[PDB]
Nucleic acid binder design. Structure first.
Lengths: 496, 53
DNA sequence: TTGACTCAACATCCAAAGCTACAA
DNA sequence: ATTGTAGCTTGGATGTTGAGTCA
């Protein structure tokens, strides 16, 4: 076949994360540079008074749209005079910041190369002289708009290597490689329109357009060729005030179905990890603009709707196909489908699509005990399912279950224990209220040495060869008032 | 728990030469097995490291 | 140019308190 | 020596991945 080992899988996931973080920090720092005062005082002189007035039109009461109009004309004229300002555009030396293949990353370490350093001063000098690749160009442009006191964001489409691509050989088509790579930009600009209350998209260098993105954006790469070096999944916005917002939603038509699959956020851990990175780069308080943009994203989420294809509904965050409901799940009472899918390939063939919020997860009595829950009195099971030598296991909903409260320890601290002489503690709930769990390889030896009243704690089950399960006795449940005594014994175990 | 030299190189590449990320990260991650667990659990610390000086 | 098939080789989740033979 | 232990050959159902074929 053509799938690498699992070790490589994990290495690619880690390298993907690391690379993403580095790219996002690069965007942050470059946004700092863009704010340079020494630069803005120079670029300010590029914008005639007439244009400044167009960028800051009078608020129009009767019809705010006319003001938007004047704003857009100013942005257009700014774009025009930026072409006059730059003149020399350089090619990207090596794929610029477009996506690299795993093979390329592997072989980059193989051969070292001289790198001409770019310091803050070099950046400023290049922007003022109008010399450089398209990225430095757009960056200068954002700097100019900021020099003219317009709320202009730098937008970066971060292109880390694709951790979903599990191929060993990851070769690319050489035909029109560069032209296809540069067909869409990595950096562009967003400008806040206070009159219509929306971010306006501005690419003055590559596509040389201004658009007011509703559902479709001219800047999202299209075509298999182009998406091999430009996979849109992390569109990051940096603002005047050192803000950092994930803005992919504006530029990705299928954020929830397609893009999500290609993002580190596709699972809970990556979600938290990315939120941590953003927060670490988000150096400002929330504004009303954020509120407006969040409403925009919420509407875009509302109107993305059900995806057109079966694959895009695998692991969707909001919807599930009828046929993908697990044997251990039920439709919540009174709910039905929330939509349908025309199945591409079969005339009139259609699949029922359910919202995930309407699917309930069921577990058996044992499974609930493993989550520290028992069944309520007169609870009726919602489903019956087979198992192995077979067996009819009943399944119950969370509402049919109750929190298990274990009996308290006696005055002397004696715990009540199961038939094997152990206490089963699979959930914090399962510790007696007046007791504590001490997890330690020697907590048993300690409690035995003190001769105090305790109970070994079965915290989980080790599955092992042969055919046989084994309990994992990871420690002790003692009364609370004996904790430090145990902890003292544990600490001095070498002296017993 | 990295050296001064490597944090310097990393900041310089990140700030002004990110086209050179690929080989540097190849070297650093090959020389710092621990980094993996740091990034996974404490990415903000790494960020702020880069954000200093 | 699209996606729904199938194939096969792994990977990943989840159950949930031994048994025999034999050396000492 | 009438107990202590090495060894038994996790698995079985379900999901993920890329290649390929078809309409």
């Amino acid at each position: 076949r053509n799938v690498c080992s699992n070790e490589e899988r994990k290495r690619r996931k880690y390298f993907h994360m690391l690379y993403l973080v580095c790219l996002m920090v690069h965007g942050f720092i470059r946004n700092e540079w863009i704010n340079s005062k020494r630069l803005s005082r120079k670029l300010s002189n590029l914008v005639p008074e007439k244009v400044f007035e167009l960028l800051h039109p009078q608020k129009d009461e009767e019809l705010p749209l006319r003001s938007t109009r004047k704003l857009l004309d100013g942005l257009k004229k700014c774009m025009e005079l930026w072409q006059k300002h730059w003149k020399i555009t350089k090619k990207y030396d090596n794929e610029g910041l477009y996506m690299r293949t795993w093979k390329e990353i592997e072989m980059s370490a193989n051969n070292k190369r001289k790198f001409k350093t770019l310091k803050r001063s070099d950046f400023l000098r290049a922007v003022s002289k109008g010399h450089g690749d398209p990225d430095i160009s757009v960056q200068g442009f954002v700097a100019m708009l900021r020099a003219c006191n317009v709320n202009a964001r730098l937008i970066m489409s971060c292109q880390p290597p694709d951790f979903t691509n599990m191929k060993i050989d990851t070769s690319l088509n050489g035909n029109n490689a560069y032209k296809d790579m540069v067909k869409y930009p990595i950096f562009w600009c967003e400008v806040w329109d206070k009159f219509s209350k929306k971010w306006i998209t501005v690419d003055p260098v590559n596509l040389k357009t201004i658009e007011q993105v509703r559902l479709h954006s001219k800047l999202a790469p299209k075509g298999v060729a182009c998406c091999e070096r430009n996979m849109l999944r992390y569109v990051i916005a940096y603002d005047r005030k050192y803000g950092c917002r994930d803005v992919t939603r504006r530029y990705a038509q299928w954020m929830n179905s397609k893009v999500r699959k290609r993002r580190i956020t596709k699972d809970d851990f990556g979600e938290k990890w990315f939120r941590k990175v953003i927060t670490a780069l988000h150096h400002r308080k929330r504004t009303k603009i954020d509120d407006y943009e969040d409403q925009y994203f919420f509407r875009r989420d509302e109107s993305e709707g059900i995806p057109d294809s079966v694959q895009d509904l695998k692991n969707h965050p909001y919807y599930v196909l009828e046929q993908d409901i697990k044997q251990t799940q039920i439709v919540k009472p009174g709910c039905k489908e929330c939509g349908y899918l025309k199945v591409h390939g079969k005339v009139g063939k259609v699949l029922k699509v359910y919202a995930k919020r309407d699917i309930a997860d069921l577990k058996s009595a044992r499974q609930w005990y493993m989550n520290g829950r028992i069944l309520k009195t007169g609870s009726r099971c919602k489903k019956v399912i087979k198992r192995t030598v077979e067996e009819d296991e009943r399944l119950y909903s969370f509402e049919d279950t109750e929190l298990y409260i274990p009996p308290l320890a006696s005055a002397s601290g004696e715990i009540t224990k199961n038939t094997f002489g152990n206490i089963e503690v699979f959930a914090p709930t399962m510790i007696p209220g007046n007791c504590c769990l001490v997890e330690n390889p020697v907590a048993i030896k300690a409690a035995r040495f003190l001769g105090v009243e305790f109970a070994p704690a079965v915290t989980s089950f080790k599955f092992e060869r042969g055919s046989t399960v084994k309990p994992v006795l990871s420690g002790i449940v003692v009364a609370k008032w004996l904790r430090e005594a145990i902890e003292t014994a544990i600490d001095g175990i070498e002296f017993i | 728990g990295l050296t001064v030299e490597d944090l310097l190189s990393l900041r310089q590449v990140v700030s002004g030469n990110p086209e050179a990320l690929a080989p540097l990260l190849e070297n650093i991650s090959a020389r710092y097995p621990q980094l993996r667990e740091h990034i996974m659990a404490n990415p903000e610390v790494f960020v702020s490291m880069l954000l200093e000086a």
